[PDB]
Design a protein around this ligand. Structure first.
Ligand SMILES: Nc1ncnc2c1ncn2[C@@H]1O[C@H](COP(=O)(O)OP(=O)(O)OP(=O)(O)O)[C@@H](O)[C@H]1O
Ligand SMILES: Nc1ncnc2c1ncn2[C@@H]1O[C@H](COP(=O)(O)OP(=O)(O)O)[C@@H](O)[C@H]1O
Ligand SMILES: [Mg+2]
Ligand SMILES: [Mg+2]
Lengths: 296, 40, 465, 173
């Protein structure tokens, strides 16, 4: 047993060293295990919330101002906008002026330090967050596709019909490209969408937004990556087919926002104007008028 | 700075040149044959 | 990395290898092969240790040591049984963990889409089922490693039982001194000290064998083989090496020192001409006629090296400070460098600060201006930017800096308002180029597509030239 | 004595932890008992009664070897189940600013490499550590039994073992 402890003293000390050395992985996973919460619960009861609670697009922005985190500056200022029921309203403005954060303010990713938005008489901070983000729809500028198949990229729940997949593909205007694929609704999208184009990646992500059949569409700059002929055909087929729904759109080019009904111009986080674009073009000292004459 | 640079063998070019001279003598059997002739 | 530096980029896009698998191959399988070369002289020194053990057993206690050594030569079929069972469990382990790693990286980039669309429990259930198939393979691995550890410790005291029971019984009565007993017990225990290690050795061998399979699988893939700086004439180009040609018969002519623009629809060949002119597509037929030299490039998706901002402008050029001021005054990062916590020494990227989205496009085209490379290939620089920054990037930058020292630039832009500014324009339709030439040439013949671009700009009163 | 080690033992369970430390101490104790009966039976030279008790405590060594092996795989399997899907259920409920702050490759390197280290590498480290540690202290106890002068000799080698380990560990970290 003198020979035994001379045989195994090295394995005692090196396995103590490897147990501490691989115990650092347990330290790092316990470091990630104690992270913070998004607080997914709701202080409003879901019996009192209706099934079609977002039934009519009556959005009351009431003194809402946001920051991304609690240390930072107010990104949006004291904004107050009455969004009317079935109406198509758009926002344009400068880069970094609050345009994408206005779309994040409806879903409460970005946090509000004052005011509240009101949909349908229901406070959105007084709401369960999964029921909030399930029944409203955002489409974002950067296309994040997933791999797997086209139908799983279209609906990952397995609950939708393939004719509605073809119809949302029809209003995406990608239907001849997916029909000419030899798989063709259950072919393969690869990882990061590198099977297809950048505007096709965006177009698949817009059809992912279209297949959810909601009542409040909100959009970011989603016509930014794509062609102008496809975006003019696209704004025609989205403003015919979703005509009852409230469609909110950040516009990259501001010539497609002339067909909208009311226009917010944001600059430095504030509502510079809240009018019809014909009235905003007829003023001619407006920042919207210098947008539309600086573009063309 | 307190640890140094390498010696010239075990510096990665010259054992990257020990390899593919190892594949110059000729698949995973060729992988194992070049690995055995490179580092036997 | 030498296989990486001549790899076809079609292998990344058509499935077979993803980028997480390629860096995972370095991060795991070279390390597993390294642990096999750490443990390879243990398997080269095992059998002479056990045969000089049994011949010293034949010297010490006689012929009942072979009856005692019957269990140690009986260890080889049970090590073959756990060898084939741990091989099948290690292969199922590696394929389910590769599916779990690819799904977890695919989830974690899409957190911003996934929490907004509220699908995180569905994707987490899919990763949970992949983890369930993994935990099935690892509970198989746990049971087969358990019976190998129990066999590798339980054969020694079975050898002390068969030897020390068979010596005091009447098969022989030669030596019941304590000398042969304690000397043989130390001989069994130094026989036993390989067998504590031997199971970790053979699971490292099977991890080595599948890593050498995936190293040979990664090392077998396909590889990249008059003032007209670019003169691709008549050449068919494909994405898929056995598929239909995505690019058909193209006859392009890029003029030297001169801006040309590439117009078409979505998915029409529009960045595919840039990657065919680079040679990143494999060729069906035809010819490229370069000048190859170094060509400046910024892609549609901008790519970021994780370094400082100044190192992402320069990108192993010389740091001349004056043209660096010229490209940051042309790309207009001068309002956006002061919003960074450092100046240009803010480290950015994946392991750094998260950027805006327009700023990564502006820093990739600010990489594209600073190269002296005389041919500048540009995918869409005004996609993520507004009309103010694309107008300041059109009055400065392109037509101002690079018009002065006469560098060739091509442009790919969905925005058609800068189509006055040209020296040539390539019109495209669906993998074929449509027609080539200038704007006076384009109202001369293709008046339908000229009127198609006239309708979209809303300049019906204005003459387009 | 990190808190991750206490997280490792408390995530395992008091049942499997008690089965591990109890069956490991009884397995090394009946190995101690088999050579002490080898001493008493070689030193006697009632015959084969001292081979019957040798067989019956050797069988306790066999089944105690089996229960130590199945407890070290069941502890490795239960913490490899349990330190996933509490992590994944915590990181999926994380707020968006934490994804904006932290690098993604740090989080994904935990989900790859530290989950693979918590999977495959550590239960082999546990069985080799428990075998080497309880085997060395039981061998130190039995050569404390045969000579009491080795305790007087043993405290210099223990204090130079602690001194060379304290001398090494700040270079090793
Ligand atoms: N990396 C790739 N690998 C394989 N096929 C591709 C790849 N990129 C595009 N394709 C296919 O080739 C066709 C041409 O796409 P291309 O890359 O020309 O798009 P693009 O028009 O340049 O995109 P954008 O409109 O954003 O400029 C697309 O229909 C797409 O399905
Ligand atoms: N993830 C973030 N964290 C902190 N601040 C941000 C973040 N994203 C954007 N900001 C800041 O919020 C402001 C509004 O930008 P944003 O709404 O994203 O773009 P824009 O209004 O230009 O389309 C910007 O000035 C930016 O600095
Ligand atoms: Mg924005
Ligand atoms: Mg493209």
């Amino acid at each position: 047993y003198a020979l035994m402890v001379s045989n195994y003293l090295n394995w005692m000390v090196r396995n103590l060293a490897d147990m501490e050395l691989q115990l650092g992985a347990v330290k790092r996973i316990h470091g990630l295990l104690k992270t913070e919460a998004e607080s997914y619960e709701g202080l409003l009861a879901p019996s009192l919330i209706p099934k079609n609670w977002p039934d009519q697009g009556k959005i009351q922005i009431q003194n809402l101002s946001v920051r991304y985190d609690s240390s930072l500056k107010p990104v949006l200022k004291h904004v107050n906008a009455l969004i009317a029921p079935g109406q198509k309203i758009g926002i344009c403005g400068r880069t970094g002026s609050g345009k994408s954060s206005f779309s994040l303010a409806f879903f409460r990713m970005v946090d509000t330090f004052e005011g509240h938005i009101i949909i349908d008489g229901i406070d959105i901070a007084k709401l369960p967050l999964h029921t909030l983000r399930s029944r409203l729809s955002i489409i974002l500028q950067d296309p994040v596709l997933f791999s797997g198949t086209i139908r799983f990229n279209l609906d990952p729940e397995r609950k939708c019909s393939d004719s509605t997949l073809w119809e949302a593909l029809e209003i995406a205007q990608l239907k001849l490209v997916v029909k000419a694929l030899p798989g063709g609704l259950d072919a393969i999208i690869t990882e990061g969408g590198e099977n297809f184009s950048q505007g096709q990646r965006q177009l698949f992500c817009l059809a992912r937004a279209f297949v959810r059949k909601t009542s409040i569409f909100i959009m970011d700059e989603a016509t930014a990556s794509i062609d102008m002929a496809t975006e003019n055909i696209l704004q025609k087929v989205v403003m015919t087919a979703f005509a009852d729904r409230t469609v909110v759109t950040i516009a990259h080019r501001v010539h497609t926002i002339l067909s909208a009904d009311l226009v917010i111009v944001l600059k430095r986080g504030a509502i510079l104007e809240f009018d019809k674009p014909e009235k905003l073009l007829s003023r001619k000292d407006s920042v919207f008028a210098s947008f539309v004459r600086a573009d063309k | 700075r307190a640890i140094g640079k390498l010696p010239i063998a075990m510096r990665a070019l010259t054992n990257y040149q020990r390899l593919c001279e190892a594949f110059d003598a000729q698949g995973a059997r060729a992988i194992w044959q070049a690995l055995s002739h490179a580092f036997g | 990395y030498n296989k990486i530096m001549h790899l076809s980029t079609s292998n990344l896009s058509m499935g077979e290898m993803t980028a997480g698998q390629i860096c995972n191959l370095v991060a795991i399988d070279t390390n597993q092969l390294m642990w096999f070369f750490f443990l390879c002289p243990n398997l080269w020194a095992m059998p002479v240790q056990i045969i000089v053990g049994v011949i010293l057993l034949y010297y010490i206690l006689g012929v009942s040591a072979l009856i005692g050594a019957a269990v140690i030569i009986l260890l080889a079929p049970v090590q073959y049984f756990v060898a084939t069972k741990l091989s099948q469990a290690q292969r199922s382990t590696l394929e389910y963990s590769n599916e779990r790693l690819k799904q977890t990286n695919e989830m974690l980039r899409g957190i911003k889409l996934l929490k907004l669309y509220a699908w995180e429990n569905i994707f987490r259930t899919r990763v949970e089922t992949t983890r369930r198939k993994e935990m099935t393979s690892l509970r198989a691995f746990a049971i087969y490693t358990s019976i190998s550890i129990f066999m590798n410790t339980a054969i020694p005291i079975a050898a002390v039982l068969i030897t020390f029971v068979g010596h005091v019984s009447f098969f022989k009565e030669a030596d019941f001194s304590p000398s042969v007993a304690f000397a043989s017990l130390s001989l069994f225990h130094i026989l036993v000290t390989p067998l504590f290690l031997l199971s970790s050795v053979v699971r490292s061998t099977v991890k080595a064998l599948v890593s050498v399979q995936k190293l040979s699988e990664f090392l077998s893939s396909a590889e990249i083989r008059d003032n007209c700086c670019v003169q691709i004439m008549g050449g068919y180009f494909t994405w898929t090496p056995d598929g239909i040609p995505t690019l058909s018969n193209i006859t392009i002519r890029i003029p030297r020192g001169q801006l040309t623009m590439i117009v078409g629809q979505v998915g029409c060949g529009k960045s595919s001409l840039l990657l065919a002119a680079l040679g990143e597509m494999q060729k069906v037929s035809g010819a490229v006629f370069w000048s190859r030299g170094p060509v400046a490039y910024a892609s549609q998706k901008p790519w970021l090296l994780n370094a400082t901002v100044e190192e992402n402008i320069i990108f192993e050029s010389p740091f001349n400070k004056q043209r660096y001021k010229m490209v940051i005054e042309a790309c207009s990062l001068q309002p956006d460098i002061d919003i960074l916590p450092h100046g240009d020494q803010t480290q950015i990227g994946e392991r750094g600060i998260n950027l805006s989205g327009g700023q990564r496009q502006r820093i990739s085209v600010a990489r594209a201006l600073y190269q002296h490379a005389n041919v500048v290939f540009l995918d869409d620089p005004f996609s993520a930017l507004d009309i103010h920054l694309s107008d300041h990037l059109m009055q400065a930058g392109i037509l101002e800096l690079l018009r002065d020292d006469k560098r060739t630039v091509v442009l790919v832009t969905h925005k058609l308002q800068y189509l006055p500014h040209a020296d040539w324009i390539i019109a495209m339709k669906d993998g074929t180029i449509q027609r080539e030439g200038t704007l006076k040439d384009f109202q001369r013949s293709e008046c339908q597509l000229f009127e198609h671009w006239k309708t979209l700009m809303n300049r019906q009163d204005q003459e387009l030239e | 004595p990190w808190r991750a080690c206490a997280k490792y033992l408390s995530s395992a369970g008091i049942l499997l932890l008690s089965l591990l430390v109890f069956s490991q101490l009884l397995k090394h104790m009946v190995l101690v008992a088999i050579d002490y009966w080898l001493a008493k039976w070689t030193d006697s030279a009632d015959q084969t009664v001292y081979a019957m008790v040798f067989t019956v405590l050797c069988s306790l060594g066999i089944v105690l070897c089996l229960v130590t092996s199945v407890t070290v795989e069941w502890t490795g399997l239960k913490v490899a189940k349990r330190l996933h899907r509490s992590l994944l259920n915590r990181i999926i409920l994380a707020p968006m600013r934490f994804f904006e702050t932290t690098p993604l490759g740090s989080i994904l390197n935990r989900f790859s490499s530290d989950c693979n280290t918590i999977d495959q590498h550590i239960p082999s480290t546990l069985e080799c550590l428990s075998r080497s540690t309880l085997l060395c202290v039981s061998a130190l106890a039995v050569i404390s039994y045969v000579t009491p002068v080795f305790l007087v000799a043993l405290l210099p080698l223990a204090i130079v073992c602690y001194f060379i380990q304290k001398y090494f560990r700040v270079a090793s970290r």
